[PDB]
Design a protein around this ligand. Structure first.
Ligand SMILES: C[C@@H]1O[C@H](CNS(=O)(=O)c2ccc(/N=N/c3ccccc3)cc2)[C@@H](O)[C@H](O)[C@@H]1O
Ligand SMILES: C[C@@H]1O[C@H](CNS(=O)(=O)c2ccc(/N=N/c3ccccc3)cc2)[C@@H](O)[C@H](O)[C@@H]1O
Ligand SMILES: C[C@@H]1O[C@H](CNS(=O)(=O)c2ccc(/N=N/c3ccccc3)cc2)[C@@H](O)[C@H](O)[C@@H]1O
Ligand SMILES: C[C@@H]1O[C@H](CNS(=O)(=O)c2ccc(/N=N\c3ccccc3)cc2)[C@@H](O)[C@H](O)[C@@H]1O
Ligand SMILES: [Ca+2]
Ligand SMILES: [Ca+2]
Ligand SMILES: [Ca+2]
Ligand SMILES: [Ca+2]
Ligand SMILES: [Ca+2]
Ligand SMILES: [Ca+2]
Ligand SMILES: [Ca+2]
Ligand SMILES: [Ca+2]
Ligand SMILES: [Ca+2]
Ligand SMILES: [Ca+2]
Lengths: 114, 114, 114, 114
């Protein structure tokens, strides 16, 4: 039911990177424990990286991605993958229109860092 | 060591189910916190279920799958996928020969239950 | 996003297995190229396998999982993951009520076989 | 190699993005149908992007990632995940030493683009 919400280990540094593939200017909001900590804005139809930041998951470890285009919330898809019981990817696609490529904004969260 | 080991939430019920797709008789050992708690043995080239059990992850939450054929450890491949930040799959494939279909024994761990 | 729909290679044997974790009796329908080829019905709150079958993907490769409880459609979550570029899992979780554990029927599709 | 090799749909544009999390300088080589078409070199312990390109998977679709540190091949872990039967991620972790964080170079391949 929930898409684009992930429970990270507490107080963990993570990377968050957003790609754009749409005619529409993407706005990507990163909320940690229900507070906006990063906003990425930009327009590309060729997978430009419109932001890449290192954030901290805080006490609650809650990380939510929200995507909007010209004030309209995009439909999200997401999952988390763990490799070798250690390397974590939290993955978000988003759809701003009708073609259902779900790539309009793509967000990759990765941890651990360092 | 780097594949077929999964850290589950402590004290959690989970399912483990093994399928066989090989000429060779598969043995799957399930260790929970470094103790063997279930063993599945069988032969099938048509995806037969050679065992399914509900176990508890215990204090440490450590679950390790070992696969061997005729006393020879198989090469493993594994990942964990989480859907909707809630539904967990720990997946193992194994290879007992040279064709690298990694389906000789296939193990699926799922939680939560109930 | 459509969920529970997977494009397989054409004319390929796969396995499909369903587990139940609900007070409600689950009915899982498997559609291959828009025709029902398997129906699994059962009831368990302890991960019982309510069905397992070997099918062929046919000419179009389209496999769709539908889940219902007492004739009412469950909400689905899904993803596909590929290990070692060869071993394929298509995963489905489903929700029949309000608790959002999405394990009420759990469906696992695996290929290749043999 | 059984890791870091992916069969993309033929003739498809994809993104490839590498991040570094190691004291050692990472060299990521991207081979498309067995030709090297990108080389990313850099050093970061804080998830800096050391490269990002848009490439075409060509007639055979084969994409391989190789990672080395001062001429020494790293151990790889990898998987592909598909959301909504449409949005694809091929994911690579690599380990250059003994701690098994598998984040020393992290490579994300995404498609479709546009
Ligand atoms: C089906 C295939 O089985 C493979 C493993 N086979 S194996 O264990 O080495 C093995 C075992 C017995 C064999 N022949 N036994 C005979 C033949 C004649 C008479 C008496 C005995 C040959 C091979 C998998 O790795 C593949 O993916 C694939 O599923
Ligand atoms: C043991 C528990 O069983 C639950 C299912 N219980 S159930 O009896 O079948 C059921 C209950 C309510 C349903 N819909 N109610 C409506 C529909 C419209 C309006 C108002 C209410 C459908 C089915 C699982 O969902 C849990 O996760 C858990 O496993
Ligand atoms: C900041 C840290 O940098 C590390 C790499 N540092 S390094 O200088 O390149 C390096 C590379 C290889 C080394 N030895 N490899 C062996 C030794 C014996 C047996 C097998 C392999 C030792 C040091 C990352 O691996 C960590 O995760 C972390 O990010
Ligand atoms: C490239 C494509 O961009 C799509 C989003 N497009 S959009 O931002 O809504 C948009 C649509 C129409 C626009 N303007 N004027 C028109 C257009 C036709 C007739 C008259 C006026 C301007 C912007 C993605 O959803 C796809 O996947 C894909 O990447
Ligand atoms: Ca949104
Ligand atoms: Ca949509
Ligand atoms: Ca779109
Ligand atoms: Ca698009
Ligand atoms: Ca084999
Ligand atoms: Ca086999
Ligand atoms: Ca439920
Ligand atoms: Ca349930
Ligand atoms: Ca390392
Ligand atoms: Ca590292």
């Amino acid at each position: 039911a929930t898409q684009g919400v992930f429970t990270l280990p507490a107080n963990t540094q993570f990377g968050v990177t957003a790609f754009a593939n749409s005619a529409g200017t993407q706005t990507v909001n990163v909320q940690v424990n229900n507070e906006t900590v990063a906003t990425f804005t930009g327009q590309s139809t060729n997978n430009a990286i419109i932001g890449s930041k290192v954030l901290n998951s805080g006490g609650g470890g809650k990380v939510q991605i929200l995507v909007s285009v010209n004030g309209r919330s995009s439909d999200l898809v997401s999952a988390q993958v763990i490799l070798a019981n250690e390397l974590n990817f939290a993955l978000v696609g988003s759809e701003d229109s009708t073609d259902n490529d779900y790539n309009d904004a793509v967000v990759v969260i990765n941890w651990p860092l360092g």
